[PDB]
């Protein structure tokens, strides 16, 4: 089916948080006691790259952002229909800019009366492959709409091992997603300068595990990392949001190490430079956006890293090598890593069959 | 297979096209399977190739399907096939670049011969269709020459070059 699902959040409705305000205005409390039915020997073909739920949560998040961070100037273009100099002029928009707090809140998605949601249970799921241990429910777990690129922030972990997912390998066109099984701490703290620290003792092991899992697809070649190849500042370097501040951070001292079956990285605290901004490139279309000056100071952020986004560089000039650069930026890609299980279904009772009896006439 | 010709110094557009009008992903791949550009959400990411700096794209037509590929400071060695990947098709185009000019920079006289230099891609046979203000319509292939150069032949001769039915106009520096 293609029905409309409603939000469900354990909001507060007393604080100044914009997420709390939106949840209070349009969301309802959670189910007091969930009920899950464990179906038996069934087999259904799951597909995640072609799901339809994401196309709705991605349009709900954008609506959510229209109540928290209003733009001082919202400069976007608009063209006039002319076959071909096609008319194209910039349009200006402006409103008030009152500084407000901002912290994501968990949100639940539920189906209305008449539909159900199947969820898988296999430990691997093969990506877009059929699984058997299925169950039926009416609502999803907690989801945080945290936004970022080049690195997945606070989010659910894997079951028992880090896994890699891709729509079609061997085409150097689709982003590769990786999910870990143990988060790695990150701490960012700071007028226009700040630093970020990540535990190297865990990050080295994480990279080792990722590479070890990765060699299977490409056994003979040698896997090597490399910094971004260039582009907009929002994708060349890590970018995220914290406390009404849009943090941009370079990530060069993490992908310069060429990797083999052995270690070649080093041999405490991994320093990471960061500088805030005021003129950013929007992710909901095209056009710049500007906000009010930053807060006085003393802003801290502590988060966990669970997932990762990696791209590939292929060609016929490759000579026993494989360079994996960091990418991302397609919010749909960032959000498919959370709704790759659930599938919305409707029940059909009717049926026609040939039997051995005959009507009495 | 649309084919275009360069000038060694000007830009050129190679437009794909769609009909959904929803900013669908795409790419621009050379004949060696190397990325050059490509939308990722609403940002831009240049390919790790030899044309990272010169490449560009119009960021206002993405809402209307047309995803051009503007290349600046074009050079001869850049002649090759390119391919779009709009939804699942393989819309592709070809470009050939050859630089036609005059070797004699400024030192010219009256009563001497003038020879032009054409640098065409190795493996192509464009035909130079020259044109002169005095009606000197010298017709030839890639290589052309002139045995006379005097005052009456002033002005940059509009000796174009055509191949496969497509012609590009060039000019020759003439100083006497």
């Amino acid at each position: 089916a293609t029905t409309t699902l409603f939000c469900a959040s354990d909001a507060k409705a007393y604080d100044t948080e914009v997420h709390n305000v939106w949840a209070t205005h349009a969301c309802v409390p959670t189910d007091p006691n969930p009920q899950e039915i464990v179906l038996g020997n069934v087999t259904e073909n799951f597909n995640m790259w072609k799901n339809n739920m994401v196309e709705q949560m991605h349009e709900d998040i954008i609506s959510l952002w229209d109540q928290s961070l209003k733009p001082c100037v919202k400069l976007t273009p608009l063209c006039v229909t002319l076959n071909c100099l096609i008319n194209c002029n910039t349009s200006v928009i402006t409103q008030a800019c009152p500084k407000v707090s901002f912290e994501p809140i968990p949100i639940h998605y539920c189906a209305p009366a008449g539909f159900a949601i199947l969820k898988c249970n296999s430990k691997t799921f093969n990506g877009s492959g059929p699984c058997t241990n299925v169950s039926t429910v009416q609502c999803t777990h907690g989801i945080r709409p945290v936004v970022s690129t080049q690195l997945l922030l606070n989010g659910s972990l894997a079951e028992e091992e880090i896994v890699i997912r891709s729509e079609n390998i061997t085409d150097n066109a689709k982003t590769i997603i990786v999910q870990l099984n143990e988060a790695v701490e990150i701490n960012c703290t700071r007028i226009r300068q700040a630093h970020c620290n990540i535990s190297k003792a865990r990050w080295n092991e994480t990279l080792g595990q990722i590479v070890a899992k990765l060699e299977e697809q490409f056994p003979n070649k040698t896997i090597i990392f490399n910094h971004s190849s260039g582009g907009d500042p929002e994708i060349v370097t890590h970018s995220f949001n914290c406390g009404g501040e849009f943090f941009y951070c370079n990530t060069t001292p993490l992908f310069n190490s060429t990797w083999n079956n052995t270690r070649t990285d080093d041999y405490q605290n991994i320093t990471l430079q960061c500088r805030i901004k005021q003129i950013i490139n929007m992710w909901q279309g095209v056009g710049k956006a500007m906000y009010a000056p930053p807060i006085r100071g003393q802003i801290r952020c502590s988060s966990n890293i669970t997932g990762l986004l990696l791209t590939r560089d292929g060609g016929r000039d490759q000579n026993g090598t494989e360079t994996f650069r960091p990418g991302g930026g397609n919010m749909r890609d960032n959000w498919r890593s959370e709704l790759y299980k659930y599938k919305v279904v409707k029940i059909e009772p009717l049926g026609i069959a040939p039997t051995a009896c005959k009507r009495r006439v | 297979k649309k084919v275009v010709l360069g000038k060694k110094g000007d830009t050129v557009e190679l437009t794909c096209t769609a009909s959904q009008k929803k900013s669908i992903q795409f790419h621009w791949k050379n004949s060696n399977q190397i990325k050059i550009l490509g939308n990722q959400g609403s940002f831009l990411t240049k390919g790790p190739s030899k044309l990272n700096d010169r490449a560009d794209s119009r960021r206002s037509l993405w809402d209307q399907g047309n995803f051009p590929l503007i290349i600046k400071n074009l050079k001869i060695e850049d002649s090759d096939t390119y391919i779009c990947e709009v939804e699942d098709q393989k819309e592709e185009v070809q470009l050939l670049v050859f630089g036609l000019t005059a070797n004699s920079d400024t030192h010219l006289l009256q009563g001497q011969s003038l020879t032009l230099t054409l640098e065409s891609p190795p493996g192509s046979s464009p035909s130079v269709q020259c044109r002169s203000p005095r009606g000197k319509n010298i017709q030839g292939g890639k290589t052309l020459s002139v045995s006379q150069l005097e005052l009456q032949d002033s002005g940059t001769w509009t000796c174009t070059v055509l191949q496969n039915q497509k012609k590009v106009e060039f000019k020759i520096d003439i100083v006497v």
Epitope: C72, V73, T90, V92, I279 | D53, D56, R59
Partner: antibody, heavy 121, light 112 residues
Framework: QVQLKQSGTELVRPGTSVKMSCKAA???????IGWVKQRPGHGLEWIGD????????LYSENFMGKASLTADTSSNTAYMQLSSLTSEDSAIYYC???????????????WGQGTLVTVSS | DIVLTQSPASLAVSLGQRATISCKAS??????????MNWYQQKPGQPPKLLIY???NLESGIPARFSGSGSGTDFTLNIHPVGEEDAATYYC?????????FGGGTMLEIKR
């Protein structure tokens, strides 16, 4: 941090045409550069504004027919060409960067050191 | 064009005292509420820098001493506290519409 540089000082004869260069090194693409002139007792006055990402043009009326700008993003260098030199054309010249879209002029976070030109025989 | 007039022509301040410079325009420049004025500073032997922009938002790296205010055709750049380093020539510019027009410039000298 974006940085700009310019060539050295020049002595030129009147009535000729000369070309100065400004080299910028983040690389600039789809940006929108302008040129500025400084002469004693006149403050400042912007001359020409071009957009390399398409080579878009915008001139000041007073300089019409006097200043021609060009750019080469391959070498990341803009060029100021001026002809019909006189004594009044002796001055300092600066190149100014920014970012794209038409009437931005709000993020001139840097300027070049400037080049001196003197018209004398 | 929008002709700008700055004041005062010459300005002297004792160290540690308030400083103010005014800029006036012949035609309004308000467009959706954002004030399109830029205040630049010039010192001998070095090129000018962007010191204040838009009259409501500060440029990074520049100490917080600077501020701006005003409306319509009367705007004011304020400096506090003044220091020995601030003796220089300050220019007020409009960033509304092309063509653009600089002001007359004002000279600030530290009084000791």
């Amino acid at each position: 941090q974006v940085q700009l540089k310019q060539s050295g000082t020049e002595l030129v004869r009147p009535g000729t045409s000369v070309k100065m260069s400004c080299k910028a090194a983040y690389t600039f693409t789809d940006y929108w550069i302008g040129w500025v002139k400084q002469r004693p007792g006149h403050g400042l006055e912007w001359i020409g504004d071009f957009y390399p990402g398409g080579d878009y043009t915008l001139y000041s009326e007073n300089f019409m027919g006097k200043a021609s700008l060009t750019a080469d993003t391959s070498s990341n260098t803009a060029y100021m060409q001026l002809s019909s030199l006189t004594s009044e054309d002796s001055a300092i010249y600066y190149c100014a960067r920014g970012h794209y879209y038409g009437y931005s002029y709000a993020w001139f976070a840097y300027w070049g050191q400037g080049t001196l030109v003197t018209v004398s025989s | 064009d929008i002709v700008l007039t700055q004041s005062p022509a010459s300005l002297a301040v004792s160290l540690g005292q308030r400083a103010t410079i005014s800029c006036k325009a012949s035609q309004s420049v308000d467009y959706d509420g954002d004030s399109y004025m830029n205040w630049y500073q010039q010192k001998p032997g070095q090129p000018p820098k962007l010191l204040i922009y838009a009259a409501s938002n500060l440029e990074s790296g520049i100490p917080a001493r600077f501020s701006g205010s005003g409306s319509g055709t009367d705007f004011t750049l304020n400096i506090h506290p003044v220091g020995e380093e601030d003796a220089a020539t300050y220019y007020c510019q409009q960033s509304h519409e092309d063509p653009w027009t600089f002001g007359g410039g004002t000279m600030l000298e530290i009084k000791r």
